[PDB]
Amino acid sequence: AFRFGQLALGDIYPQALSRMSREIDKRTSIEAAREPAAVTLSSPTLHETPFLYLAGDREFAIPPEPEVEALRRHLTFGGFLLIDSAEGALGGAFDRSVRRLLQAVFPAPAPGLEIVSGEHVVFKSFYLLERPLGRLALSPVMEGILRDGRLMVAYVQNDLGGAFARDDFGNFQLACVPDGERQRELAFRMLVNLVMYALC
Amino acid sequence: AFRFGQLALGDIYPQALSRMSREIDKRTSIEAAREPAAVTLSSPTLHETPFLYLAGDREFAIPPEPEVEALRRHLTFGGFLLIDSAEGALGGAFDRSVRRLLQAVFPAPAPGLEIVSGEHVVFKSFYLLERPLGRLALSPVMEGILRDGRLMVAYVQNDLGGAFARDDFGNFQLACVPDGERQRELAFRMLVNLVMYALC
Structure with a gap:
């Protein structure tokens, strides 16, 4: 069963990962484990979760060199990292930390963060x-x-x-802005596409 | 200018009332004050806000007799009370407190809480x-x-x-369940209808 590696660098949405797994199970033929694995970059078993997930809404420190190198190797040998900002606006403390992290993982002149083409297959990998x-x-x-x-x-x-x-009553908690529940569905599909792309 | 009397009996959604006023201003020819008045039932100037608003999500004590009588008179002489549960499910602590309150305000055999007909003019008082x-x-x-x-x-x-x-960024904060932004608009319209009914 697919299992997210939840990378913990500094739980904004308790149980959002579990909900992501449930959607992968409903929507696809992939069996997704309900419980993500909480992982750190110094974990000896980082490799057990090819798909890493990093969410946050504030600053986090650049990890130490062996951890940066562990991440670099994880990715270069076939892993995947989804970084997801919850800050609510662009270009805040989390964004600044993300950019510094990725500069450490892949120093110039290596390829760095660039805009992904709308024609990239990730956008058509399931939905x-x-x-x-x-x-x-x-x-x-x-x-x-x-x-x-x-x-x-x-x-x-x-x-x-x-x-x-989700809220305490099993419903979706937060509004999707500006396009509502249609947008929420497109978000869910985006997540599924990222997972299916990374796995296949 | 119309002004809500916010009745405070035990601020779930900071600034939701201000947003309600802004909607009355955009949608109608009524001028609505941005700041609601925080009012208590023992206030000598309760009468200045015919429209009272009571929200909550937990238990509250029955007010003392002079306060119950102040509310009774406010309503019988032309005022209006909107009670709005934020508890997230039906029939919780707030609901129990509401029912006890209204039994005190209007003892049997007076009319008590009953289901409002879908044909009542409140449902067609603006929208x-x-x-x-x-x-x-x-x-x-x-x-x-x-x-x-x-x-x-x-x-x-x-x-x-x-x-x-609303959230800290000026957007709608919470999901409307199950029917999303269409439902949010119908909620906004319901509020406008209640105000316009009470005023007219």
Whole structure:
């Protein structure tokens, strides 16, 4: 069964990952484990979760060199990192930390964060999509890091996890802005596409 | 300018009332004050706000007799009370407190809480509506207290205020369940109808 590796660097939406797994199970033939694995970059078993997920809404420190190198190797040898900002606006403390992190993982002149083409196969890897919608729709594009056309890192500032967040009563908690429940569905599809792309 | 009297008995959605006023200003020719008045039932100037608003999500104590009588008189002499549950499910601690309050205000054999007819003019007092939607859609009906066909108290368990709640970035905060932004608009219309009914 597919299992997210939840990378913990500094739980905005308790149980959003579990909800992401449930959607992968309903929507696809992939069996997704309900409980993500909480992982750190110094974990000896980082490799057990090819798909890593990093969410946040504030600053986090650059990890130490062996951890940066563990991440670099994880990605170059076939893993995937989804970075998902919950900050609510673009270009805040989390964004600044993300950019510094990825500069450490892939120093120039290596490929760094660039805008992902709307023609990239990630946007048609399960659902047919156009842009990376989340709870928000601020950014019209996704950023990422490519290696030989393969997306190794996807960075979404539009808050995918917030679309999945639920209240104490089992309902969706947060509004998707501006396009509502239609947008929430497109966010769920974006997440499924990222997982199916990374796995296949 | 119309001004809500916010009745404070035990601020779930900071600034939801201000947002309600802004909607009355955009949507109608009524000038609505941005700041509601925080009022208590022992206030000598209770009468200055014919429209009272009571929201909550937990128990509150029955007010003392002079306060119960102040409310009784406020309503019988032409005022209006909107009671709006934010609890997230029906029939919780707030609901129990509401029912006890209204039993004190209007002892049997006086008319008490009853289901408001979908044909009542409140549902067509500005917008054409069918049912009292809020953030939620649990209850298919509105309850209220009538005097000679006039609605003096409206009680909505579907959380109107939660539809108006905004985040720190000026967007709608909470999901409307199950029917999304269409439902949010119907909630906003329900609030406008209640105000216009009470005023006209």
